């Protein structure tokens, strides 16, 4: 069937991807698995999926993996480091690359796949949040097919016409009858919290999403709507959408995953169970479909679906991200990096919930960097913004 390289195989998206292959063993052959330090999970994945190669970024991890696969009788070839990860993404016989490495580390392996003209199942945030200009230029150049894995972008992609789906990132929305892209977001645990009380919210309260169970960092991004601000940046790049072609809508139940408004009045949407195997199986099978293991959405067991307009006084981070987009990749890169710093400080009880947006803004004000021209330039902006942000945190706590 299709030959896959999975970048970040041991993480949450990687495991979900492998479950899709598990459900479809005649449609997908795992050629290469790439991870960072989780040797234990990597051994089990090598023993199940029989890849030609397994790469650990960490050298000690690669050495341990080799000894365990040997002890277990597997002939999977073990590589290490970043060049090896890029080589797997670029293998002549692979069809699809699941781009699921977390952070700036996912950037060069992702680009290797784009440069090799692969089908990219895109689930690394930094690719378009930080490198949207560079990566979209590179996709046009190699004719790589991007297929977004993130639930919102995937929902938009499924609700978009064929000429846009082929040509993703270069097609013209208006020419294809599209008025706007409707990005939906839960609004987080503090949708109805009095504004006064936001300053005193605790990490446990911020991470206590009534509709989720997720990592703490992304839980907090959901409470601030920084997570939607970042998807807004990705969406503008992915779908070639101007600011007037984007709408952000609060949808508390998260049943509708996002939508697309058309010239005749029609709105197309994707709905489903909250399970990343759906969007992953969509991207792996496109333009066809496969079983993902996800059960059919039961419309008789739903909460009523509601929508509201986001209030920028309640979600300053959402506005910041929209503004940062206008200023360029140095600003979006800086916002992303600042935000990692400030959220981790919030979680470590070094700053208040409301300090996240105020410090993110403060970093952006302090910076003026010029437009990145390559991945080294973005990495440099990211590194600088983190330092600015860590000093801002220390100031507040001191």
Ligand X SMILES: NC(=O)C1=CN([C@@H]2O[C@H](COP(=O)(O)OP(=O)(O)OC[C@H]3O[C@@H](n4cnc5c(N)ncnc54)[C@H](OP(=O)(O)O)[C@@H]3O)[C@@H](O)[C@H]2O)C=CC1
Annotated binding site: 10-13, 36-38, 124-126, 150-152, 186, 209, 215, 222, 227-228, 231
Interacting residues with ligand SYC between 221 and 260 (CB under 6 A): 222, 227-228, 254
Nearer to ligand SYC, 208 or 209 (CB): 209
Does 269 engage in binding with ligand SYC (CB under 6 A)?
no
Strand partners, 262: 178
Of 133-141, 156-164, 182-190, 304-312, the segment contacting ligand SYC by CB under 6 A is 182-190
Interacting residues with its own copies between 133 and 172 (CB under 8 A): 158-159, 161-162
Q: Binds 258, which of ligand SYC, its own copies, ligand X, none (CB < 5 to 8 A, cut-off by type)?
A: none
**DSSP β-ladder status, 246-250 and 267-271:** unpaired
User: What is the b/e burial string over 194-212, where b = at least 16 CB atoms within 10 angstroms of the residue's CB?
Assistant: eeeebeebebeebbebeeb
Considering only 18, 31, 33, 101, the residue that binds ligand X (CB under 6 A) is 101
| Three-class DSSP category at 151 | helix
Q: Which two tokens stand for residue 321?
A: 């991200």
CA–CA distance, 354 with 359 (Å, rounded to integer) = 9
CA–CA distance, 48 with 23 (Å, rounded to integer) = 13
Of 96-104, 186-194, 255-263, 372-380, the segment contacting ligand X by CB under 6 A is 96-104
Nearer to its own copies, 179 or 320 (CB): 179
Interacting residues with its own copies between 281 and 300 (CB under 8 A): 281-282, 285, 287-292, 294-297, 299-300
In degrees and rounded to multiples of 5, residue 121 shows phi and psi of -85, 95
Q: Which two tokens stand for residue 191?
A: 């949708």
- As for the chain, the residues directly before each break of C–N over 2.5 Å are none
> Which sign, positive or negative, has the C-alpha torsion 140, 145, 150, 153?
positive
Does 185 engage in binding with ligand SYC (CB under 6 A)?
yes
Does 123 engage in binding with ligand X (CB under 6 A)?
yes
Strand partners, 259: 182, 269
CA–CA distance, 337 with 347 (Å, rounded to integer) = 16
The site string for ligand X over 273-292 (x = CB under 6 A, - otherwise) reads ---x----------------
Which residues of the chain form contacts with ligand SYC (CB under 6 A)?
Answer: 185-186, 188, 209, 211-212, 222, 227-228, 254, 274
Which residues of the chain form contacts with ligand X (CB under 6 A)?
Answer: 8-14, 34-38, 57, 85, 100-102, 105-106, 123-125, 149-150, 276
């Amino acid at each position: 069937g299709k030959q896959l390289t999975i970048l970040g195989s041991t993480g949450s998206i990687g495991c979900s991807t492998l479950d899709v292959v598990r459900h479809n063993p005649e449609h997908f052959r795992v050629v290469a698995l790439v991870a960072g330090k989780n040797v234990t999970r990597m051994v089990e994945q090598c023993l199940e999926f029989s890849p030609r190669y397994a790469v650990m970024d960490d050298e000690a991890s690669a050495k341990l993996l080799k000894t365990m696969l040997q002890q277990q009788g597997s002939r999977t070839e073990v590589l290490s480091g970043q060049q090896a990860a890029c080589d797997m993404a670029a293998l002549e016989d692979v069809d699809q690359v699941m781009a699921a490495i977390v952070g700036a580390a996912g950037l060069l392996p992702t680009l290797a796949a784009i440069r090799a003209g692969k089908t990219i199942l895109l689930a690394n945030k930094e690719s378009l949040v930080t490198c949207g200009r560079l990566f979209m230029d590179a996709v046009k150049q190699s004719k790589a097919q991007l297929l977004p894995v993130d639930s919102e972008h995937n929902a938009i992609f499924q609700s978009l016409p064929q000429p846009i789906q082929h040509n993703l990132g270069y097609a013209d929305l208006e020419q294809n009858g599209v008025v706007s892209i409707l990005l939906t977001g839960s609004g987080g645990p503090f949708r109805e919290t009095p504004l006064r009380d936001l300053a005193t919210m605790t990490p446990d309260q911020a991470c206590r999403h009534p509709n989720w169970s997720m990592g703490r960092k992304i839980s907090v991004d959901s409470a601030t709507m920084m997570n939607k601000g970042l998807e807004y940046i990705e969406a503008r790049w992915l779908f070639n959408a101007s600011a007037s072609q984007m709408e952000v809508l609060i949808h508390p139940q998260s049943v509708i995953h996002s939508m697309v408004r058309y010239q005749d009045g029609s709105v197309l949407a994707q709905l489903g169970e909250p399970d990343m195997r759906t969007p992953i199986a969509h991207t792996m099978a496109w333009p066809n479909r496969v079983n993902s293991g996800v059960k059919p959405l039961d419309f008789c067991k739903l909460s009523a679906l509601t929508f509201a307009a986001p209030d920028y006084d309640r979600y300053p981070c959402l506005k910041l991200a929209m503004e940062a987009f206008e200023q360029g990749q140095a600003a979006t890169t800086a916002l992303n990096a600042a935000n990692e710093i400030t959220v981790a400080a919030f979680l470590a009880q070094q700053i208040r919930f409301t300090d996240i947006a105020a410090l993110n803004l403060s970093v952006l004000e302090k910076m003026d960097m010029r437009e990145p021209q390559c991945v080294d330039d973005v990495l440099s902006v990211d590194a600088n913004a983190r330092e600015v942000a860590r000093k801002e945190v220390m100031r507040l706590a001191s």
